[PDB]
Design a binder for this molecule. Structure first.
Ligand code: ADP
Ligand code: P0D
Ligand code: MG
Ligand code: MG
Length: 471
């Protein structure tokens, strides 16, 4: 007989078009929406369809205009001002209110509060400290160093003085990033000491302007850290991928169960472009990645959750840990694992949260892909790179994006292609990762052909649009 799962419904992780239908199959869902403005019209519709109960924070609603849902949201550009403890209390109350058996979220930002609520209720969860470890990058990097994985120098940074010391201890090149966000927001590579101060002041000012719930707490706002150098040629046998991978897994009563590795196409700066399900890497490479992710996620002390772990492919086949999340990967990675292997990770997670290791957990990475699926985005920068939009262009207005015939290698096909709606206005001022202007899916028998098709589409896609220039 059916169990009840509290989902903290917000942006990120497993996309609504899969999560709610997958969850509802065997579970009664209660949906808590702490941030009603973060819910798209289509997300809203899926929430009500598949939920036995829906609870929104009523304090957001002040007039009729508050009840409108946007068509598209990438990052929620509005304030949520409740302290962590108050958010925790809200989760526990909604859970008691409805007799919840489990709590899950797809949202990075509410991971730590969710953990506190779970343990306060005797339910399965990330573990209080482990979730903070998977959310505060200073704490994260520390746990990584103490675990058996590749260690790097790192330091907490709050003030300019902290940054200058960090630049003295650790050298050029160094990674400076906010400790508590996602989506590569604020993540900066400093390569020369002569303009390093200016860059820190720039990113410090920039950070103050990012909308984030007050419930996200942190030891220090920045981490300064060694840059993890990749060696493509030590890992991949063909071109088309990149220096890094993610690996998706599940933690179950403290044990790491790897599911799938994703290959990647080169990012734009630190903005991601494509994910390929599954990885083409050999069995020896995969084993190294799995070992790193096992040590890292167990090193965090994570108890019960989905896992999204990013790894830099370094010299001598050494896995370098970028970051790990106690939640599902974003974009279509989780649905694409289901298309390729037939495994529904959303159902698997809830099964683990309700039954522990009694769930149908795979031992080792899924294998015997019948083919490869690519999740790909296009950005204004692609159209600057290919000469269609000049560098100083302003306020792009997109009519259409079309893919010319003849760009696909081998048997690769376009399964779906979706451009921004005719007439949408894109602010070229925004951080690139916020500005996807098309999404497409590729399928093929041959990974290299898939990746090469991606590069071709990125190069040759035709934009129909208008932009502004100053005289
Ligand atoms: N120490 C590092 N060495 C090399 N690259 C890094 C490092 N930290 C971050 N990056 C790059 O920045 C991207 C985003 O940073 P990340 O640590 O994943 O934070 P988030 O994705 O949560 O913003 C990574 O995918 C990686 O490409
Ligand atoms: C694909 C990326 N690796 P991601 O999964 C992107 C986050 C972004 C996100 C968007 C809105 C709210 C929370 C997270 C997400 O979609 O959940 O994690 P990270 O690598 O950015 O940390
Ligand atoms: Mg993150
Ligand atoms: Mg990341």
């Amino acid at each position: 007989e059916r169990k009840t799962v509290l989902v903290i419904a917000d942006l990120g992780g497993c996309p609504p078009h899969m999560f709610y239908k997958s969850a509802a199959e065997k579970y009664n869902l209660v949906s808590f929406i702490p941030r009603p403005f973060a819910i798209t019209a289509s997300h809203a519709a899926l929430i009500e369809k598949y939920s036995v109960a829906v609870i929104k924070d009523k304090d957001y609603f002040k007039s009729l205009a508050d009840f409108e849902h946007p068509d598209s949201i990438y990052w929620a550009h509005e304030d949520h001002n409740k302290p962590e403890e108050e958010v925790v209390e809200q989760i526990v109350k909604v859970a008691e209110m409805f007799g919840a058996d489990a709590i899950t979220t797809n949202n990075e930002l509410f991971i730590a509060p969710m953990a506190k609520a779970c343990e306060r209720l005797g339910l399965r969860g990330a573990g209080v400290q482990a979730a903070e470890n998977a959310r505060d990058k200073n704490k994260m990097r520390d746990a990584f160093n103490k675990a058996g994985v590749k260690s790097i120098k790192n330091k907490r940074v709050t003030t300019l003085e902290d940054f200058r010391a960090a630049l003295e201890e650790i050298g050029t090149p160094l990674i400076l990033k906010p400790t508590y966000l996602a989506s590569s927001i604020g993540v900066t590579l400093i390569t020369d000491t002569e303009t390093a101060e200016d860059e820190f002041n720039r990113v410090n000012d920039y950070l103050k302007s990012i909308n984030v719930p007050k419930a996200v707490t942190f030891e220090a706002p920045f981490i300064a850290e060694e840059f993890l150098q990749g060696e493509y040629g030590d890992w991949y046998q063909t071109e088309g991928y990149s220096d890094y991978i993610s690996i998706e897994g599940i933690m179950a009563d403290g044990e790491y169960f790897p599911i799938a590795i994703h290959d990647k196409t080169p990012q734009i700066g630190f903005t991601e472009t494509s994910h390929i399900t599954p990885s083409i890497l050999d069995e020896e490479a995969k084993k190294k990645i799995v070992e790193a992710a096992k040590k890292a996620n167990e090193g965090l002390g994570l108890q019960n959750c989905a896992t999204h772990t990013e790894i830099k492919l370094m010299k001598n086949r050494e896995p370098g840990l970028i970051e790990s999340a106690a939640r599902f990967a974003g974009w279509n990675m989780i649905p694409n694992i289901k298309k390729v292997f037939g495994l529904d990770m959303a159902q698997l997670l809830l099964d683990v949260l309700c039954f522990g290791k009694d769930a149908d957990l795979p031992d080792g990475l899924l294998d015997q892909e019948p083919y490869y699926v690519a999740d790909c985005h296009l950005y204004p920068q692609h159209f600057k790179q290919n000469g269609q939009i000049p560098e100083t262009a302003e306020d792009l207005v997109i009519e259409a994006i079309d893919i010319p015939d003849g760009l696909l290698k081998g048997d690769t096909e376009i399964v779906s292609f979706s451009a921004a709606a005719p007439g949408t206005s894109v602010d070229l001022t925004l951080f690139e990762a916020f500005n996807s202007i098309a999404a497409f899916e590729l399928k093929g028998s041959n990974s290299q052909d898939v990746a090469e098709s991606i590069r071709q589409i990125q190069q040759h896609a035709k934009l129909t649009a208008k932009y502004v220039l100053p005289v």
